[PDB]
Amino acid sequence: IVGGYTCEENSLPYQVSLNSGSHFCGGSLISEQWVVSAAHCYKTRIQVRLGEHNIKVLEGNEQFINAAKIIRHPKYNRDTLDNDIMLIKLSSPAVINARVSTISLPTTPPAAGTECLISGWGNTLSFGADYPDELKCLDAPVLTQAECKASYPGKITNSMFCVGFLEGGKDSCQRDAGGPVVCNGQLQGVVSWGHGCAWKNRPGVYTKVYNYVDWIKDTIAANS
């Protein structure tokens, strides 16, 4: 996250870190046993780290749980990032407390102009790189679809929306992928195209979670 702020510790209790040795992607806890992330974050083995603030320091509220099932959307396209969404089933249920809690699925798509919260441990610089120890946050509005399409002509599919500032300065960046975009208490997005890194006319592109609610439900049911 570029141009954001350090979140209050454990104030985003749905935010998880995906780990394969080290942190490499974000995700969101949507039920005691399931996490939503980006399909491009797939690895054949993933440890989900919940309750984190500083990912380098065991602070005492963490839960480390291995992924038991890692399911990409079946229409995921690695090249275009169409349908860039994935579900992780945890090996044991998360323990719900002040520091580990779920985020509601959305009941409607988000309107342009809605204020959202994007978070993660990705690069915090537009020039060079700094990967933070503590979770970063960014408040940003949903952009109109025309602004999104004009930023990336021919590349914005029906599964995508943009959040940010066409002027640059505040955005997601490398290793925020997979993480949450939360608007009015609901998970509306998954960080998908997180290479814009706050450059002008290159806002972040996010997967429209609302378009996948039925797939999410069906997948949970099929693997429960």
Ligand SMILES: [Ca+2]
């Ligand atoms: Ca920690």
